[PDB]
Design a protein around this ligand. Structure first.
Ligand SMILES: C=C(C)[C@@H]1CCC(C)=C[C@H]1c1c(O)cc(CCCCC)cc1O
Lengths: 120, 119
């Protein structure tokens, strides 16, 4: 019928801090594993942070602004994907949303947004 | 309601080039993604490329087309272009344009365009 995304993570850190987000897809996913995160910074257009597809992590995508600092990964034991956010910067402050890209339904499911605040 | 109109596509010899275009009209906000999917016989819709109205955002290419396809936007016209170079027989498929505002969960699905590369 519908997909459900259970997200975890978020917090308040200082510049250079580190946080991990997680997202677990369930429901009638039909085995699709097209996952990612987008963020919504105050006053900006949404920015798709990272995407991954397949059990083997093809079509790996990172926004330029997070390359080298963010890593998306899967642990297939859980159908859980993770976003490791290292060396966080002030401009990373945003609401972060896990996304599930449904290419049967042509539908982007969103997790519950989670605030990440990076400030001195 | 959003409506999509595609153009381009057809038959090419291997190593040849094609240009697809897709123009979104209507309720399209200014904040949206557009891109291309392709579907070969007996296969699912496969992601090809996408581009955002956010120009801090670099375009996204599937591994299977990186280096050969180039997506670009005419914000003027709410129209995106896919420059498909060095086409191989494996690129043969119905290619579909797709559109999704940034605020929406449901994408709009465009009308398919045959791309056949052969011999
Ligand atoms: C309209 C496109 C391309 C599709 C349509 C179908 C679905 C389920 C989602 C859309 C989509 C994005 O909306 C955004 C991305 C990632 C970022 C792209 C550009 C940086 C992938 C992505 O499949």
């Amino acid at each position: 019928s519908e997909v459900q995304l259970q997200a975890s993570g978020g917090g308040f850190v200082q510049p250079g801090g580190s946080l991990r987000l997680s997202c677990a897809a369930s429901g009638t996913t039909y085995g699709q594993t097209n996952m990612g995160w987008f963020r919504q910074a105050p006053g900006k257009e949404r920015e798709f942070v990272s995407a991954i597809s397949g059990l083997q992590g093809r079509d790996l995508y990172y926004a330029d602004s997070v390359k080298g600092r963010f890593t998306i990964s899967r642990d297939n034991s859980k159908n859980t994907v993770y976003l490791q956010m290292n060396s966080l910067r002030a401009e990373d402050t945003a609401t972060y949303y896990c996304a599930f890209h449904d290419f049967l339904r042509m539908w982007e499911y969103w997790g519950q947004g989670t605030q990440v605040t990076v400030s001195s």
